[PDB]
Amino acid sequence: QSMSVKGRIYSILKQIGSGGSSKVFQVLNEKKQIYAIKYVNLEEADNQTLDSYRNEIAYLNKLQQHSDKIIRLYDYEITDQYIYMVMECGNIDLNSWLKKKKSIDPWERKSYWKNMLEAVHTIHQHGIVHSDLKPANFLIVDGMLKLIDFGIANQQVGTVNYMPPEAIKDISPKSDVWSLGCILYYMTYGKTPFQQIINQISKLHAIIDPNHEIEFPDIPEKDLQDVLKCCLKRDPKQRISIPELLAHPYVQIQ
Numbered sequence: 040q041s042m043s044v045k046g047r048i049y050s051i052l053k054q055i056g057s058g059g060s061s062k063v064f065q066v067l068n069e070k071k072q073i074y075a076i077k078y079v080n081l082e083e084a085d086n087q088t089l090d091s092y093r094n095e096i097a098y099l100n101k102l103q104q105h106s107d108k109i110i111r112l113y114d115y116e117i118t119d120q121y122i123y124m125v126m127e128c129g130n131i132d133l134n135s136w137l138k139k140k141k142s143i144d145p146w147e148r149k150s151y152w153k154n155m156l157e158a159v160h161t162i163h164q165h166g167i168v169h170s171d172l173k174p175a176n177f178l179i180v181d182g183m184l185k186l187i188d189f190g191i192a193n194q195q196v197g198t199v200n201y202m203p204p205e206a207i208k209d210i211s212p213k214s215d216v217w218s219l220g221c222i223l224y225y226m227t228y229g230k231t232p233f234q235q236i237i238n239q240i241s242k243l244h245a246i247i248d249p250n251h252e253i254e255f256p257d258i259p260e261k262d263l264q265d266v267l268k269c270c271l272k273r274d275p276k277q278r279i280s281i282p283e284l285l286a287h288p289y290v291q292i293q
């Protein structure tokens with residue numbers, strides 16, 4: 040097939056993924072370069088939905104200049120019927136990589152943790168708190184993790200495994216800290232902290248319950264265990280901040 044974003048023509052390669060009203064494609068431009076085009080249908084979209092979309096685009100377009108750990112938005116075409124976004128194409132999303140891969144390299148993990156802190160820190164410096172961080176929000180692009188979205192735009196998906204206790208109780212940057220710790224905990228232990236609880240009502244009860252001790256099995260990396268223990272502190276007031284995580288021995292020491 041084929042498609043037009045501004046003047047430029049794009050040959051479709053495959054469908055990289057989906058959404059409700061959205062479809063993502065792997066494409067080639069006239070210079071035979073690879074990109075991702077996110078198509079969004081605005082046909083049955085309300086004003087609040089439209090505005091949530093316009094807000095997330097404006098933020099992504101802006102924050103691109105601030106960090107390379109944020110996905111590139113090269114161009115876009117917005118009408119009253121559709122949105123076309125020409126973005127950088129990834130190799131695989133972090134969830135699909137983690138699900139496929141057996142064990143993760145301690146260096147690979149440390150490197151990915153670093154990238155995650157850098158992307159989230161950036162959004163936070165611009166007043167953005169994602170609140171729905173999951174491995175699916177990150178993209179491997181040449182051994183580099185990139186943040187896919189900001190959580191602003193309406194609508195794995197629906198998962199409560201990375202949900203902070205305060206979000207269940209009903210939201211500060213500390214909420215994203217909890218969710219990041221759940222991601223690192225998965226990369227460390229091969230499961231999210233409350234993954235063994237099937238029942239969603241029982242799972243939500245465990246997360247909020249302080250008498251429910253989160254287990255941190257002894258790994259050779261004492262620095263990595265401390266990060267996990269720091270991130271996964273139920274009281275947001277007792278939880279480590281992102282600027283504090285960037286100065287932690289796990290990130291800084293050889």
Ligand SMILES: c1ccc2c(c1)[nH]c1cncnc12
Nearest residue numbers: 075126127128129130131132
């Ligand atoms: C936006 C831009 C690029 C991608 C995306 C969403 N999902 C993906 C999944 N796998 C690879 N690349 C991408």
